């Protein structure tokens, strides 16, 4: 119970640090007396950059705030094993088009124009209302499947948020993706799974 409170506080560290943060996601595994703390980003290069000072500024602060032992910890660069599944960059890329502009509707389409490319099977990008600074009337765009809510637990759901502050109006966002299952094979689309064998002249036949 008390241990559950402790776990929640550890999660809170990730929430505060990876609030805005113009990189992409952080899974953390905790090895004995050290935190691996793994950044899963394309631009994982800038945030580290090796030796300098940069890397030490990230680590140290977290330790004095919340963990155990006057010691170092660890920080790891990672690629991304599908940018779909989870990120932060997925939302931030859309934001980085709602700068200088380009049509808001066109920018929405471009995010989907990726995602399905890296598999997905369904995607829904949904961008905040108030085009031309009118009343809110959020706009969709979707191809394929896509279950955030309804079907089983293990849909593998990307969800985020962001804001874009104009002169007249906020333009929110919430990029959403329903992708594959953890890359190794373990695909299980929508919970009941049909499957047949191939052809029945038997003495050999079996499959799944």
């Amino acid at each position: 119970v008390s241990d559950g409170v402790f776990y929640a506080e550890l999660n809170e560290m990730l929430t505060r640090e990876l609030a805005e943060d113009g990189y992409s996601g952080v899974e953390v595994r905790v090895t004995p007396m050290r935190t691996e703390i793994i950044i899963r980003a394309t631009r994982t290069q800038n945030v580290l950059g090796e030796k300098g000072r940069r890397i030490r500024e990230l680590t140290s602060v977290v330790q004095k705030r919340f963990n155990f032992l006057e010691n170092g910890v660890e920080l790891y660069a990672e690629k991304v094993v599908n940018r779909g599944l989870c990120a932060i960059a997925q939302a931030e890329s859309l934001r980085y088009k709602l700068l200088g502009g380009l049509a808001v509707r066109r920018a929405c389409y471009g995010v989907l124009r990726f995602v399905m490319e890296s598999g997905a099977k369904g995607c829904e990008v949904i961008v905040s209302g108030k085009l031309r600074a009118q009343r809110a009337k959020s706009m969709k765009f979707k191809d394929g499947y896509m279950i955030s809510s309804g079907q089983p637990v293990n849909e593998y759901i990307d969800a985020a948020v962001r804001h874009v502050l104009l002169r007249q109006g906020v333009l929110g966002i919430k990029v959403k993706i329903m992708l594959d299952w953890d890359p190794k094979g373990k695909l299980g689309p929508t919970t009941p799974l049909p499957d047949l064998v191939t052809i029945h002249p038997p003495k050999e036949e079996n499959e799944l």
């Binding site: 299980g188 919970t191 009941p192 799974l193 049909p194 499957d195 047949l196 064998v197 191939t198 052809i199 029945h200 038997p202 036949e205 079996n206 499959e207 799944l208």
Partner: protein, 71 residues
């Protein structure tokens, strides 16, 4: 109430019978084993549902041709 066959059940039930037929039987218990061989269904109740429905169909086939099942 409750106990109507779904679309997911309807598609699968025909298919299993069609290309497993000699091995398939009227017997419920053995055809539960067959569904393990032919597919992975994640929960227990799914396996029992399909197995029961297929055996009922097997009886009908051996008493007159069934509309969407051809052997």
């Amino acid at each position: 109430m409750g106990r109507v066959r779904t679309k997911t059940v309807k598609k699968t039930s025909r298919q299993v019978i069609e290309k497993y037929y000699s091995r398939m039987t009227l017997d419920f218990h053995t055809n539960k084993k067959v569904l393990e061989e032919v597919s992975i269904l994640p929960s227990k109740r799914l396996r029992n549902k399909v197995a029961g429905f297929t055996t009922h169909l097997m009886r009908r086939i051996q008493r007159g041709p069934v509309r969407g099942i051809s052997l």
